[PDB]
Amino acid sequence: HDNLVLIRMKPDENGRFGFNVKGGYDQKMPVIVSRVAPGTPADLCVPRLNEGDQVVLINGRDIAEHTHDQVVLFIKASCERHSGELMLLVRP
């Protein structure tokens, strides 16, 4: 819960971010960014979202005891975006 980076990104015209997430409570694995595809919002935002980053918060929500499907639903919950941006707190 230290050396954390706050990442802010707006989605594309199709409402996608360009990253993959693996893990969650049900899989007994931490939530990890498995891919960051080129030229996408997760690739072009500064600070950049990187592969291997562990997701800690999504729009301020603690994901520790949440299932993989709940994490994905949190990412897609556009109404929870502060000023239309998805906020992530990650551990590189």
């Binding site: 971010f17 360009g18 993959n20 997430v21 498995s34 897609k76």
Partner: peptide
């Protein structure tokens, strides 16, 4: 399992 967002 990994999901595309």
């Amino acid at each position: 399992i990994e999901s595309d967002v």
